[PDB]
Amino acid sequence: DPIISRLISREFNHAGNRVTVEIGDHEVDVSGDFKLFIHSCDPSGDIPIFLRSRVRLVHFVTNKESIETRIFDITLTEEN
Amino acid sequence: YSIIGKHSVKIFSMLEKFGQFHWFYGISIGQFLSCFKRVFITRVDEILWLLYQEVYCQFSTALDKKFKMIMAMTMFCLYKFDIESEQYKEAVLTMIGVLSESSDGVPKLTVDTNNDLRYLWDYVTTKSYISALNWFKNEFFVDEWNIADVVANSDNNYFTMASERDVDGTFKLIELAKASKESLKIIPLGSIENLNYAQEEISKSKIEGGWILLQNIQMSLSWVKTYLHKHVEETKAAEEHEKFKMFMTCHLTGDKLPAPLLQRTDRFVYEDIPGILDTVKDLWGSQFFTGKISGVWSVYCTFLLSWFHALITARTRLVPHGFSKKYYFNDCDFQFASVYLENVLATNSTNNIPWAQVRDHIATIVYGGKIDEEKDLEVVAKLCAHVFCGSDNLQIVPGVRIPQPLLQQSEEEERARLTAILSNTIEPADSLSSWLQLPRESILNYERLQAKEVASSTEQLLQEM
Amino acid sequence: NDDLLKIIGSGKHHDQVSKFMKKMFGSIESIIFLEDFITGVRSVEGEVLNLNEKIELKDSIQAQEWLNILDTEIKLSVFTQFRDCLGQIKDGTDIEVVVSKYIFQAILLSAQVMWTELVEKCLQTNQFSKYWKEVDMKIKGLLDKLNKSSDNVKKKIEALLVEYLHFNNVIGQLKNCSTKEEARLLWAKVQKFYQKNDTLDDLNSVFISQSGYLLQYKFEYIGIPERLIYTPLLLIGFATLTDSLHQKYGGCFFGPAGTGKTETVKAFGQNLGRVVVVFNCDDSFDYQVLSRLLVGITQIGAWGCFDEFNRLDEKVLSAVSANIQQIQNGLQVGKSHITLLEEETPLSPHTAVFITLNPGYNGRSELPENLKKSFREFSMKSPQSGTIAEMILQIMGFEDSKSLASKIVHFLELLSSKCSSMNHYHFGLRTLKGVLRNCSPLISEFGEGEKTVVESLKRVILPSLGDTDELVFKDELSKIFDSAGTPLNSKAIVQCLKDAGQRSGFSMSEEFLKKCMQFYYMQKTQQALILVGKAGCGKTATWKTVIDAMAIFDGHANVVYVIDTKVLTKESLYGSMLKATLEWRDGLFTSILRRVNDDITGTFKNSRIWVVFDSDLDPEYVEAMNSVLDDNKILTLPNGERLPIPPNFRILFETDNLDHTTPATITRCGLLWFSTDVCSISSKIDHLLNKSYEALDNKLSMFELDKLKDLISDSFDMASLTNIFTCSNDLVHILGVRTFNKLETAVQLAVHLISSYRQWFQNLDDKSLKDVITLLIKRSLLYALAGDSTGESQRAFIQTINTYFGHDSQELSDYSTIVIANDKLSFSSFCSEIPSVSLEAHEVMRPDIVIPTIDTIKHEKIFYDLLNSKRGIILCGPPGSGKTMIMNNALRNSSLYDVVGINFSKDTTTEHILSALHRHTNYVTTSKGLTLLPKSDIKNLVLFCDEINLPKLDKYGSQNVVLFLRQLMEKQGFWKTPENKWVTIERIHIVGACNPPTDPGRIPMSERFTRHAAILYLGYPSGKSLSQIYEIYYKAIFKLVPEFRSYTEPFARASVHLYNECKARYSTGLQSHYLFSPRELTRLVRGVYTAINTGPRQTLRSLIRLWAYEAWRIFADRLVGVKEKNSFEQLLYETVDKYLPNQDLGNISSTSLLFSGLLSLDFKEVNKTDLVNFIEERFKTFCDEELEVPMVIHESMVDHILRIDRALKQVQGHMMLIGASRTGKTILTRFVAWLNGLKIVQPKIHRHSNLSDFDMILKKAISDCSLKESRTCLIIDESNILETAFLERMNTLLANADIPDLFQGEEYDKLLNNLRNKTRSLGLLLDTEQELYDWFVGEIAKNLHVVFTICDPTNNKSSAMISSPALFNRCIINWMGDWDTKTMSQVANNMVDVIPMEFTDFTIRDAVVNI
């Protein structure tokens, strides 16, 4: 959903002690010991362009390409 | 290793693509790794050819005869296109093009330049299709593993063997257990009692070490995802457990098995199809176990039905020429036919002439029940015309005549006589056209079509990668 | 449980249990008492069973105990009534005797048993003939007794007939066999009903034999059900059923719907003395209820049929299918008790389960695996028809039933092979059952003969055939069988038809009489009629003419309700239920029936009621009526009722196509296919003239009228026009409308133009008079055939007109007109004389400003003439071609008409049209039209519907909004959608503009709507008029710089050259949004003025650069990429060099000319260095004061900031930014908005957001802009537009400057109220409702600023933004799509400004950025 949105762009209103972020309606306090990660299971799924541009996209995927890399390790152990 | 590496992805891509077409056709990366380790225990050229061979040896088992030959033509092109000449590449492709309806042309000839390839076009040009399709298999120079071999080599306690509804490897598994290590337990999954007894015999056989079978799981499936899915996954103590092997029978055409359970277990495809005479001998074979409620005369009718059933089943495979669509006929269809036969003799005189409504009821209710197309409904009937009405001499097939029961009237002796008529006969090479009254010209049309289907799906696969 | 609790509670009463019996028996409806004793029961069919022993009842008796006796006795009672009867017939008693004394179920079984016994013996003897005639006699005897019988016993005879017929048929078939073996085969296939004359326990005494297999008749009461006619196919079904059961298997038949799979299972039950429980599975059916029923069935030993089993939800289907296996496995084995639903319940072995499998979208459905070895699957097929036909003929009163049946079938079968394969042609049995149904009343007229058959064939088959196939029917009907020479009712109806049309204005053509005849004869039989044909066939004329002829012939009045079917929703029409309170309110179709059915307070018995559906017909709507189309003649509510329909009440369907409707729907109704137009082109005109003359009688004296109708006759003869209408085709017609349907546009115009100059006809020369007539007719005839043409084509057609009219007769010229003096009668023909406009600098941009042209006046004249005719006009043409101005100017000028603008979009509703009207309209309930909706003020109203070929269409493909206008144009009122009556719109006109429908976006409109419009194609003007027009525009703005008065022509000529080239160089082929028009020119002209009106004294070097900056912002800001952007730089250079030759120019690239009022008090070109610093000081501030987000100010940003600034400064400021992502299009907007002092509103949407949320966000921003004077900037991102409506809202917000739906009804009154408060506060009271709204709207138009930020325009959701007209026309499109190499390096530089680095090889920092 769009509401996380301001939390994805690192946007805030700085205050006397508090750091406030607008979520949907209520302005809520950010800790700073707070961390955020987003997890997805299907690479068929397409994420919104707003997110995809501000998000560090990392693929933990067990590919067909992964075979090429892994066959050499097994080959070399039985060749040299 | 890059030269080894580039080939192996394109191989995995191909085996992966079968899993897209069909659910049972799955392959993990681990399965490909484990297979490539087996390849060890011009150096690069031999190791490469060792890969293509070992992949064909292990993954040929989990596919059906069509996809065996698709993978054969493909894998052959995956090797030889990189390895041999460019003169070679368009020559073999111009041949695969003729088998398919893509194009028909004559490949590049150099005297003694290519001999294996000179031999292949001879198969394609002789309009001999099945031979040309197998050419690609044989060129691999692999010993093609029997279910037993596969099982023996295999180092897992689980197996799921799917098959077309025409057959069931249940009886193959009986002789497979008998020839080595015994311990056979057949378990139907039917009604709460069967599943309930079943789950009891599952936990106990693994501690005991007996072989177990789960017949036609697909029907009791809702249970599988809940009990069996978790049970087989949890049983990495089955590694701890006594030498024991669990077997599961599937149907390819049918409900999709849970992929996680399926990929964890080894996979085979019974593809093993009996001749007419052997099915006749196998139908007639059990029939003596029933005992006696009827006359000697009936056994003649039950013999007739044995032939009949074995003749419709034979025809079921060859479509379109043959039947319009695939119909499946069962031991249920024989059972319901036999029961009407006992009933017609139980209600009528032993005068032979009751014959007329025997045909109508066999050809329109018992067997014509599932038949919907008018075209095929006539075929069942025209078979009944031939199989049932006979006077004195029938001549079911051109080799074999069945004479009507003799005055001696021995029920012992007529069984033995009708078994004898089987043992006298030798099933001709051309059975499908001689015995099933359809033309030879039709059979070749069919052979062509399954060729075209292998040839197409291969071209398609190569262009995709 | 609920019902069970009532029964235990109602034990006291006893009588109250009878309600629940209908349920727990199936067959019976209520129980009969003598208070202490039960005398018997009655079935749902009406039939009354009396028990042998009347069951005694006492206080201390349980329901359980007394009813259990009843079930026993009801079965016993049936055996008694069976043996009583069987015995009687055996003792030679007339079957007509037995009928009156024995319940059907008893006599049926007695029949079967005696029949069988008599045919069983008859097979040995071969005395078939003796018994056959014998049986045939009983058939005839039963038939005629039926005509004089009481309705109850009428069912019983009929139901027996089904059986007797079967008896004879089988004997027949037996008599005929080649051999005895052939006969003994046939007999085995049949159900043979035996009794055991050996044994005790009589309810087990009857059994049934089939295929060798036997089956005990259980003695359940069945009542008298509608009995299925026996077919070979039928017996077969019964045969498989018995064959499954005999081996303890379940029966299952799959096959397509309508093959009567469950009906079979039901019928097979009844034949064996069983009432089958039918489970309709997945009619949102509870599993919990079925689970109960299954236990009940296994206990009671009943038969249960799963009606359409396959369509159940997979978790339910698993659960059920597993349960069923228990039952089927319990029986196969014979388990005493089986366990199902986690309890040990017993199994009756008499139990059986039946499964019907309708096919899916995939194919013919399958049983779950487990059920495959538990059931026997069978393929139901439609019956080969011959067999069904014979019987039906037998039942009616046969004559020769065998001959007719064979001949009827062969014919139908033949038509199929012989006629053309045409969409709606059905020659299947449905159709022959129809021909046969239609036959029964016809027999009443003639005979139970072939002749009655032959008539019914042409009565149904022919009215549906089209001309080629119309003879194949006749050729092969007489080829197969010939019946008669002469027709009854031949003279009588015809004179009542001719007299109807003479009166109505029509001509009695060979075709119109035919299609009138076909109709007449079909009402008679059929209650639902369909009339299909091209728009302007003559349907509404045919039926309106025939119905009218029947009030002359019968003397019966009619009451017609013509309803446009698809203007209203299923809910508006049939009856809609409200989601929580479940409150039932009427609708439209149901409501007009209740005047006839519920309260026939006036004369309705003697009247005829016709409900016409003029609109397109669709499945969704007919399905909700299918029961009235059925033999039922009753209307089924979604909840609450069935309403019965009288024989008076006839439903017609008038429509153009059938493609959507099902063959099923056709074959219940009578179909009347209109092959071609009923009437001659002449004959149409004829009627059309007289129709127009009638109008004038109410406003023109007989002497005047007589003379004007004389003129018309002599000026245009048919002979001339015939070639002219043929030449019409040989042209390019935009928004194609056929020649026939253009006629009304001629005649209405022609009559109006001649009636116009009536005073100058009194005294003028009779030779000269002809010339005024001939000219006007030549002109009216041009716009009505060529008005929608290129005009390059018009001019071509003009000579074509003159050619075929008399050569000497007054010629038509391109600009041809008739002129008369102010204060004197004068005559002469002069053309193309034009005013000149002088306007000041301020006036230059004004939403209503037209510089009159040779074509402004041309168009405006015709356009106004058509309204005087009062025919709806459709103005079709390219964007900016002036359709809207021409239409607006012509009417903002006159006192007579007053305009209301409705802008249409992809999805506009028919209430939107109404809401727009509600401000300018005043309902009055005058008894003249009942409710009326006439303009609020006394003078005429014009609704201008812009973008009429924008609204979309149902999934069938039907735009209702358009049918709604069609409704208004043709019908002249409309039906009120919730409140339910007819309001007749008074003196409101319909006008519409629209783009060529070859254009993208565009939807093709129904010729049934466009036939009612005059179509005028307006294209672009000249490139020479454009140059002329904008000169006069520059003239006005150069009153501000008078020293360059000589420079206005080269500026106007340059602006047009720039336009001509941009339009040609940047086309929709490169990019969609490359769409230019004279709007851009006008935009540029004004853009220039505003810069002057607020700039320092201008040198010619200033002015050209001033013009160049505007030229950039209007034409090139939208350009993507750089090949094209450089192309424009050189174009602008190419144009200055050709029109403004100076060596004082500089770099014309947009980076070098930067114009602003941010530094200066006046709008001036500013310095690059002065600006960047100005932004730097302002961005820190904006960064500090408002959201903290850091960015690097680069050359492109300054250029972009100015872009948004000019946009956000203009009155209506709309910009849509296309910026890829991270470009900063959203951030710069927030900035420039803050510099301009604009409140940034940014719709707060999310995954869960409703339209109402977005509605709220909009409403506030609007209310704050007028009633708080807010000056807001609305930033809408592509992400915000969640649904289609959201974007529709955004459109309404730009094309109009309000959202009407937000402020409607009482929320309208609250707004209206608040508005008065603030208006006074500022210093004016505004008197009228319109005065205030126009301020409200005008305030929004100047305070609301919508900026759109769309990232990938390639995306199909973001495509729809740019697509939408409203957005595209009112927005300033800007392109930010890629970061250029220069701007990248500039940004990189400032980011690596921090210096950890130290000197290296080569610069060091320069190299890192380049990498």
Ligand SMILES: Nc1ncnc2c1ncn2[C@@H]1O[C@H](COP(=O)(O)OP(=O)(O)OP(=O)(O)O)[C@@H](O)[C@H]1O
């Ligand atoms: N006998 C006749 N003489 C003169 N004119 C006729 C005659 N019959 C029909 N017309 C003309 O044809 C028109 C009939 O309109 P009608 O509504 O029947 O057309 P339609 O085919 O139903 O169009 P749509 O399909 O859009 O409803 C009338 O306007 C009338 O001018």
Ligand SMILES: Nc1ncnc2c1ncn2[C@@H]1O[C@H](COP(=O)(O)OP(=O)(O)O)[C@@H](O)[C@H]1O
């Ligand atoms: N005679 C004229 N005088 C002034 N402007 C004109 C004239 N003819 C055309 N135009 C210009 O062309 C545009 C007409 O387009 P528009 O009013 O949107 O018509 P439509 O809605 O049919 O496209 C206007 O913006 C106007 O500036």
Ligand SMILES: [Mg+2]
């Ligand atoms: Mg009409």
